[PDB]
Every structure is written in C-alpha cells, then in structure tokens.
Amino acid sequence: MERYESLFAQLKERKEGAFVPFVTLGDPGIEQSLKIIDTLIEAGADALELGIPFVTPAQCFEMLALIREKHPTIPIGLLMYANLVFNKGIDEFYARCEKVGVDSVLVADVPVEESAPFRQAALRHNVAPIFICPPNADDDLLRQIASYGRGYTYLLSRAGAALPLNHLVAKLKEYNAAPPLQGFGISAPDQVKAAIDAGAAGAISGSAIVKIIEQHINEPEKMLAALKVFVQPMKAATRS
Amino acid sequence: MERYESLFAQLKERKEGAFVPFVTLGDPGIEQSLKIIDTLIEAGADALELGIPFVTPAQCFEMLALIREKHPTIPIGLLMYANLVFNKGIDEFYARCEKVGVDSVLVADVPVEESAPFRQAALRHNVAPIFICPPNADDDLLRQIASYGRGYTYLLSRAGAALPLNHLVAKLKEYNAAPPLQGFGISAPDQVKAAIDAGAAGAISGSAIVKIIEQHINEPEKMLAALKVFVQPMKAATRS
Amino acid sequence: MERYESLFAQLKERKEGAFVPFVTLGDPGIEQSLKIIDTLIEAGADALELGIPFVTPAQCFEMLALIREKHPTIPIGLLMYANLVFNKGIDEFYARCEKVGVDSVLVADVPVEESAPFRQAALRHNVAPIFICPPNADDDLLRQIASYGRGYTYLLSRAGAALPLNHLVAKLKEYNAAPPLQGFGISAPDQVKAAIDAGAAGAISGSAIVKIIEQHINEPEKMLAALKVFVQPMKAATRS
Amino acid sequence: MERYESLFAQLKERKEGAFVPFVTLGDPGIEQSLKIIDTLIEAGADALELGIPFVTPAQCFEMLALIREKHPTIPIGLLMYANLVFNKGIDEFYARCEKVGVDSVLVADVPVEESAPFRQAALRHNVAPIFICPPNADDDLLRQIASYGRGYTYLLSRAGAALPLNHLVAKLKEYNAAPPLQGFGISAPDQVKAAIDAGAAGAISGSAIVKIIEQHINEPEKMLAALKVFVQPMKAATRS
C-alpha cells in the first residue's frame, strides 16, 4: 500500500529490485538497534522488515515511531507471531501500528484461512495484510493469497514439491498479487542477484544481519561498519 | 493522487519543493517537443505541466502516452480550456487521459461551481481534479477547493485583495488541501526560492520556457542546451 | 593579483566560474552608470570589466574610487586603448589606477611585443598587466602571454585558424597563465554555460548590457530591472 | 603502451575510468582460473592485473598466451616479485612476456633506483615498465616515476605522510606520467567511485575477488556468478 506501492514504482523505472534486510527491534540494544536500522537504510535498504520480540512492545512501537519520523517514506513492515497481537486485542494492535508508521504486518502462526480478523483489522487501520506463499503453493492458495494481500508478498524459497521460483512470480503477475519479496536463506549477493532475475521484486535477509551483530556485539562502532559493508553489495545485487 | 502523492513524499524527506515547468505539446514541433520534455526532466523537473493547443489531440495524447512510457513515475498534469474536453465528451476525455498516463487535468474556463461533471469524470477515470486558488480567495472558496481537489493545488500568485502567499499555504494545510504549486510570473530562481520558503510545495514557470524556445527556434540542438541550462538553477532554487 | 586571485580561489571551492559584465563608465550618465554597476554587482557579478571612454578621466577615476569604496573586494579591471594612458604618462596612469582601486588594466591597441613599458608600469604600481590571447595563438604567443600577465587572462573567442577553446585553456593551465576569462559574442547563458564547461574561468558580456541600457535609456528605474533580470541567469550559467 | 594507451583513449571519450580486478593465475585452479578471467572480462573489466605465484611459470605464461588469444585488446599487466624474473634471467623473462601478450610488468621488491635492468629489459621487449607511487611520494620520486614508467601508473592509496590522492594525480598530469590506476583497499563501488572523482584513471581490487573465490571454492559454477555479480557494480562505479 502507498509506501510499498510507490517504492515499487520507483524501483521499476530504475530497473532494479529491492533489498529488504531483517532485524529484531532492540537487538542487541534499543539505542544500538536504532543505530542499526539507520545504518542499514543509508547503506542501500529500500524497505525494512522489522522483527518483534516476545524489550516491551511499547518500546518497539516507540522505536517504530522514531524510525518513521526519521525515515518518512521507507516501507516499514513488521514480522511476528500472533501472541503479541492476540495480547493487545487484534484491532488495537493494528490501530497502534497505523499510528506509529508501520505499513504492513505479517503474522506467521496465523494460517491463511484463519486470517480473517487480521486481514480486516489491517484494512480498517490502513495497514497491509501480508501473507506467506510457500514454494509448493497450489493454484488455489496462490489465488487466495493474491487477492487477500496488499503491499508486498512474502515468497517462501524452496529452502524453507517446490516449483521453480519463476512459475510463482508469474502466477502472481497473473492474479494481480502484490509484488513478491523472496525470503529465507538469502544472505549473499549471489542469491539476491538470482532472486531478482527470477522475477521477484526484492530479497530479504536476516541471518547474516544477526551473525555480524554477533561477532561485533562488543564493538558498537565496529558492528555498524560490518553492517555498512554488508548492505551495499547485497543491495547492488539488485540492479541493472 | 498516487504519482503526485509519492513525489511529494520523497520531496519532504529531501527537504525540497518541486519545480514544475510548463510547455505546450508540439511546441515548436512534435519531435522537438518530446525532445524538449525529456530534456526538462533530465534537468531537474519533478513534475510536468503540459499545455494543450486548440497539432491534433490524438497526437498530443499520443505524445503523453510516449512520455509516460519513457518516464513512468513523473507526475503528468495537463493544462487546458473546456472546449477540447467539451469536444470529446467530458467522460471520454478523462477516460482517454487515464489511458495515456496523465495524472491530473486543470480546466481553466470551468469555474469552481460548475466543475461538477469534471470533478466526477476525473474521479471515475482515476485522474486528479485540479482547481485554481486565487491570491484573494475567501475562506469559503478555500474550503471548496480543498475538498474538491486531489493531487496538487494550483495557487495563483498576487500577480495574476491578494493576501500574502503564506496565509494561503497555511489555510490549505488546515483544510487538508492537496499540496499547493504556485504558478504565474515565476521565471527566476529568486521567485522559486521564495515560493518554497512561503510554504508552497513547488513552483511553475512557462514564459521563460517559451522565450528560450523562441530565441532558438532555429537551433534545435542549441535550444535544448539553453533549456538544460534553464532548469538546474530554477530546480536548485527549491532545496535545503 | 590579490583580488583576482582570491576571487578565483573562492570560485573553485564553489565549483563555479565567474560572470564578468562589461560597462562603459558614465554610460548613459555618471549617476546612472554608478547606479548601474552596483546593480550588476548585486545581481551576480563576480568581477567588473569597466570600459573607459575617449565624461573626463578624472571622473571615471572618481567613479572607480567610489565603486571601490562601495565594493572593496570586487575585482575591478579596466578596458581601454593606449591614448588615455599615453596621455597621462604611462606611469602616472597606473599609479593613478593603483590609487583608485583598479586591479588590472588591458590596453587593447598595445601589441604584445610593445607592452614592455605597461607591463612594468602596472607592476611598479601593483596593477595586473592584462593581455589578449586570440583563438589562433601559436605556442609561442601562448608562452609569452602566460608569463607576462598577472591576475586574469583575456581569451578571445573564435568569433573575434581558431583552435577549439579547450586546447587554449589547457595550454594555459600548462604554462601557469593567469585564469582565462573568455570574452566576445557571449550574451547568453548558453554561451556562458559552455564557456565554463570548456574550462574557462569566466565569461564577459557587454553588447547585451548596452542594448538593455538602450531600450531603457528613458526609464532609469526600468533600465536597472532589465539589467537586474539580465545577470542572474547569465551568472547562474556558471554553476554546478 | 599501445593497448594501455588506446584503452585509456576510449575511456576518455566515454567519460569513464577503468576497473582493473586482480587475480592470481591458477587460482583456485588453472582451468577454473581461466574460467575466471573470461568472466571478469565479460563483466566490465577494462584491463587485467594478473598475479604470479611463487602452478609453474610455463603454465602461467601458457595461460597468458591463451587469454591474449581469447582477448586480443584487453590490457594484460602482471604483478609479481623479483625472484621469478631473477630466475629466468631478466631479459628472457620480458622477452617471454612480449611473446605471450602481456603489456606491462610491475616487479614489487625492485626499488625504483635499482629498476634499471628491468626498465631496459621491458623496453627492449616492448613491455611497459610499471612503478609504484606511494601516497607520500616527494616531488623528486614523482618526477622519477613519471619519466621511467610507460603504460599505466600504480598509485598507492593512503591505506598502504600521505598527501590527498588529488595532489598526486595532478602532479602526474603535470610531469606527463602514465595514467594512474589506484590500488590497495578498494573493494567497493564507493571507493572506486571516489578513486575516479579524485582524477585517477582507474581502480584495482583483489581481496574481494579472493574472498568470493573462497566462499565458492566448491561451487565452480556458483563462484563465477558471485564474481559476475561483483564486477558490474564496481565497474559501473567508474562512469559519467
């Protein structure tokens, strides 16, 4: 929706896909985390995929509000399980997401057929209902997902029968599904480079982002450089 | 709408307003005209304000289609009188605008209270209904315009009682009116620089664009350089 | 020298060349003339190229003294024929130039090989000896000019065999000649824009300045606006 | 010389610098190595910087011969220590380089003042004597290098007192030294982009090329893609 849309528009004209790193809010720390997200951004990031722990929620939402204010157009999408949402009452969650800036919210554990209350809640509070399309999704599921989801589409790699990731992108182009962002096991310019050739609109990585934070969880300033060094290439793997 | 929106979004983040040159399709020629628009674009132009003569319409629309294909996200807005529209049947006009790429259409002669059929037609065919806000618009008119218009807002300068151009921008910010682009008598980085300081979202110039085309209506290649030299400064007048 | 030097220094850092209009002292009148120069300055002028008639000399020097006092750092260079100088005794001329503020003096009619007494006089009274480098200057002449001249270099356009104006700028960069200011037939942002791309350090125009004074030699107040409108663009043609 | 010259000529006209990756012949294997060089080439490489191990020499020269035959105009320059050369008798080495295609040969360990026999040998067998210009080279050294070297110039970065890399490029332009290719610690479009802005004629990288070969020293086909993905950006960092 809006942000995601436009971002994808200016990605077309540039003949390039998007690189969407994944990070866990408040990891390793709140001040550091923020200090991370900005760096990811100014390194090539076109859209963030922010993970939510369980650092309380009010803080994670407080950071999202900060990020937003700091970065107005960057597509902010969250990734979490149903508990937190089930905790704050479905509606109030999304309403609280619509108030801090988030553009979309993917609730793992919620299976497609039981998404109803979320798909509505996000739509009620202008948030994009995001779904996961497994590598082995049947024509039926494809059709479901395509219509139900707004913003972007989370395409599951054949690493998480899996039809080649090209058939899928097409089967989406066909049923007007939101632009697909392939995720899972993509921590190399190689895989990102391929992801896009296959027709996906962008890649997502998170493991690598974690490992680097790990090896430098003592060097706050060094940790960022490694991350600053990490993006550019990955992000560059999505061009010309 | 969409294009205009997003453009304005990435203009905020950049802390800069938009420069919107005005040109008349097929002026001085069709091949040249296009050769003009591209040059204006690659010089700093953030959004085009394309004038329509009466070169037949089918050609002007044919050029708009070309431009669009050549420049996918650039906000394309037209500027013309009610005849051409009244000629092709209100609806079919906008429908034909929605098919070639245009994002908005400002129909001069149509007074605000008699816009109804256009405001609808544009909305039916996803085009932004644009209106003119004179420097001396009463609180009433402001409210009218604000609600009726989508995309951008054409703010008339005190050169075309005129309240200082700051009150207006505010009175729009207040009534959630589309971002105001000030036009008329602004052919200098000076006036563009000021336009933006006053809070306008961007400036429009057309006379200068004409004069240059005039002095070089014999040097197709030279004509472009003068224009290439014309933008940058003007466009630069909208930053930081 | 000094003024010219520093001016050129702060022109580099800005990544922009200089715009040097030319005007004839006391044209159309003494009070008006001054009223002209200030306006040229406050419009973008980086350095003046003041022409000398034959309004007696004592007045022209009186104006230069006024200008200087009014504008301390502006590089003031004069342009005249050898008579006036031959009139007041070479030395006393330059000494009188060093006393009113002028920074340089280009004596047309004086050929390069017969400049000796002037090159000395200007050096004796801290004035920059300026020379003209024709578009068809042989390697020899280039070397002469380069060494003999201080301050700036007057590069003659291929409009006044002429080697492309790029070879020249280089051949000067090579023989450490003063920064070259191209003059003759440049009355358009176009030509100024190109002059600088070619590597020249600045452009000079005078015809246009005259024409405008001509069309408004009845509107003292209007005449200035036209001139105020004339600079900015021309001057803007020398940036980024 | 010749190849290097012409390459630099068609680089000017294109307004772009050269990207010169570095690889070690027979790394990780002979068949693979070649399979590497071709890929580097068809990815954007304008000139190769081939490293020599100590895979025997006869093989490395056999590969150079193959490469050359496969790629006739690509500037082939080698990078090695004095032993191999001292091994095959200075002259016979260069003579053997002139026979396989190499255009230049940089012999590290050989200090500038003891280069004599090499500078001659390369000149006798039409090979370009290459030298290293440290970031802190005094005016003297600059002059030495400039005259003694043909083809290109290896400009050492302030990462391997170091004067800003702009002074150097100029000081070479001044003493007509072969076009400078900056090397050491440049494994990012960033640094390549900057290298060129500073006026260098091209950049060199080798670490990155190694790391990639490392992470994929098991995926011969995958290894190439990563490398294919590596160039383009880096090479693109040298344009417009």
Q: The domain spanning residue D79 has which CATH number?
A: 3.20.20.70
Find out whether D49 and D233 touch, Cβ atoms under 8 Å: no
Q: In chain D, which residue's Cα lies nearest the Cα of A193?
A: D229
Q: What are the residue numbers of the active site of B?
A: 49
CA distance A192 to chain D (A): 10
CB pair distance less than 8 Å for A72 and B5: no
**Within a 10 A sphere around the Cβ of B176, how many other Cβ atoms?**
8
Contacts with A6 from chain B: Cβ below 8 Å: 2, 5-6, 9-10
Range of the domain at A7: 1-240
CB pair distance less than 8 Å for B72 and A13: yes
Residues 6+ apart with CB under 8 A from B77: B4, B20, B47, B48, B49, B50, B102, B103, B104, B105, B106, B128, B130, B151, B152
**CA angle, D155 then D157 then D158, to 5°:** 135
Q: In chain A, which residue's Cα lies nearest the Cα of D190?
A: A232
In whole angstroms, what separates CA A178 from the centre of its chain? 13
- φ, ψ for residue B179 (rounded to 5)? -50, 130
CA distance A234 to chain D (A): 10
CB pair distance less than 8 Å for C193 and B225: yes
What's the token pair of residue D154? 């290896």
The helix (run of H) or strand (run of E) holding residue C168 is helix C165-174
3-state SS assignment for residue A181: strand
CA atoms in the 13 A half-sphere facing the CB of C16:
17
Q: Which of D209, D213, D221, D229 would you mutate first to test chain A, the one with the most A CBs within 10 A?
A: D229
Q: At what angle do helices A220-236 and A189-197 cross, to 10 degrees?
A: 30
Rounded Cα distance between A197 and D44, Å, is: 19
The helix (run of H) or strand (run of E) holding residue D32 is helix D30-41
Residue C113 burial class via C-beta count within 10 angstroms: exposed 0-12, middle 13-18, buried 19 and up: exposed
CB pair distance less than 8 Å for B9 and A71: no
Method: X-ray
Contacts with C232 from chain B: Cβ below 8 Å: 188-190
Asked if chain C contacts chain B via 3 or more Cβ pairs within 8 Å, the reply is yes
Which residues are A156's β-sheet partners?
A183
Contacts with A2 from chain B: Cβ below 8 Å: 5-6
The type of residue at B234 is M
What's the token pair of residue B109? 């002669």
**Within a 10 A sphere around the Cβ of C87, how many other Cβ atoms?**
12
Size of interface A-D (CB pairs under 8 A): 26
Size of interface A-B (CB pairs under 8 A): 29
Find out whether D46 and D20 touch, Cβ atoms under 8 Å: yes
Q: In chain C, which residue's Cα lies nearest the Cα of B237?
A: C236
Q: In chain D, which residue's Cα lies nearest the Cα of A188?
A: D226
Q: What does DSSP assign to residue C185?
A: S
Q: Which of B207, B219, B229, B230 would you mutate first to test chain C, the one with the most C CBs within 10 A?
A: B229
Number of domains in chain D: 1
Rounded Cα distance between A7 and A2, Å, is: 8
Residues 6+ apart with CB under 8 A from B122: B94, B97, B104, B105, B128, B129, B150
Rounded Cα distance between C108 and C177, Å, is: 19
- Which of C188, C193, C232 is closest, CB to CB, to B190? C232
- Which of A188, A194, A236 is closest, CB to CB, to D233? A236
CB pair distance less than 8 Å for D188 and A232: yes
Asked if chain D contacts chain A via 3 or more Cβ pairs within 8 Å, the reply is yes
CA distance D236 to chain A (A): 10
CB pair distance less than 8 Å for B72 and A2: no
CA distance B189 to chain C (A): 9
Resolution of the experimentally solved model in angstroms: 2.8
Residue B38 burial class via C-beta count within 10 angstroms: exposed 0-12, middle 13-18, buried 19 and up: middle
SS3 annotation, D45-84? CCCEEEECCCCCHHHHHHHHHHHHHHCCCCCEEEEECHHH
Residues 6+ apart with CB under 8 A from B205: B19, B20, B21, B22, B183, B186, B187, B192, B234
Q: What are the residue numbers of the active site of A?
A: 49
